[model samples]
Target: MSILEDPEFVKLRQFKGKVNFNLVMQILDEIELDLRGSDNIKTSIIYVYSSHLDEIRKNKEFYDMIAEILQRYYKKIGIENVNQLILTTIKLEHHHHHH
Candidate 1:
């Protein structure tokens, strides 16, 4: 099982008080604006994909869970968008031509 499946990790999903949807939406809108203006193509695309609420909800913890994981890697971590959108491109190499 993945680390996320653990009981300890599941507890983090419960907010101490109230959950702010408006704040989350505001942050998402800001990310969309940044993606449209930013020069970094990769980061911009990632930001766009992460803005979807339906996809974000698929993962219970969503943003908070990711923050916890990244925290182990870096002391100071920042997150703009959060989702399960994995952007990838498939390339097929042809070794021989068939006609």
Candidate 2:
């Protein structure tokens, strides 16, 4: 199946939520060059549009995947800032979860 046809996002069709295959693709496209550059991360982390935050939560892997990609670049420099960047960027107030 095509990346867009992945069952994960197909479910979003009826949920009418904030994310979709198109959104994910658009995000990847936006960051592709940044990730490709050798020093982009040295200046700033990739800027993700906030519109899809909720939908991104519904698909946590997508959110984490972006962070991980950013981490790889930071990893090269041995400065782990992606986690802090994510926490600060989202700015959501909440407590930890337990099952």
Candidate 3:
């Protein structure tokens, strides 16, 4: 099974309070690894953020969970590299705005 199929992600889904990432860079790296120069990477990133945001409000700990991980890496890069929206929020209301 893929790493995504592991109990860790399962626990993340369940919000069992088991989120512990020593290297936020690694997590972001995993997502970015195969995405270099590939078209639609922004779409891919948005999709993950979108899905997570949808689930997050339903499960706020899940929101907090991902935010915690995001904050770690986001902090290291500082304000110069990313937009405020990406650095501070993932609150994309696609359904509300897209239609």
Candidate 4:
């Protein structure tokens, strides 16, 4: 299963509402990612995009998976909709959840 299909986002799917980020500074290192890199940049406490994922931008299979997620989820849930998700990553540190 794709990372998007994991329970975290699976429940977030079909959601019809706006979203927000608490720490835009250090978003790339917390919850972790499907793609990772050692030569990327960071600001401590945030997790951002990975260089390996950037390479996916030039590939077709990446979007094939993206299309699958998009059709079943919201724009924000899909990797290609930067307008809704921006370059931001979903942070997994310092927040409390009932789930």
Off by over 4 Å in 1: 1-12, 39-99
Q: For model 3, how does the per-residue alpha-carbon lDDT over 1-99 read when each residue is reduced to its tens digit? A: 122323333445454432223232333443344234444434434544565455435546644445443333334552222223222233324443565
Per-prediction RMSD in angstroms? 13.5, 14.2, 14.4, 12.9
TM-score, model 1 to reference: 0.28
| Residues 1-99 of candidate 2: C-alpha lDDT, one tens digit per residue | 122323433333334333354655555544544555545642333365354566556767545544454546345443234333322333324532631
**Local accuracy of candidate 4 as per-residue lDDT tens digits, 1-99:** 244444434334333112334322122223123223232222211232243344334432432332343334432343234213322223333454842
Return the TM-score for each candidate structure: 0.28, 0.35, 0.26, 0.23
Whole-model Cα lDDT of every candidate shown, in order: 0.37, 0.44, 0.39, 0.31
The order of the candidates by lDDT, greatest first, is 2, 3, 1, 4
Error of 1 at 97 (Å): 63
Q: For residues 1-99, what per-residue lDDT tens digits would candidate 1 score against the true structure?
A: 133433433454444212344544543454446644764434543554476555445443644443343232222222222321100001113432552
Scored against the true structure, residue 73 in model 4 reaches a CA lDDT of 41
Task: Give the poorly placed runs of model 4, Cα more than 4 Å off.
Answer: 1-3, 6-58, 75-83, 86-99
Query: Quick one: best lDDT, which candidate?
Result: 2
Single out the weakest 10-residue window by summed lDDT for candidate 2.
1-10
Best-to-worst ranking by TM-score: 2, 1, 3, 4
Model 4 poorest 10 in a row by lDDT? 37-46
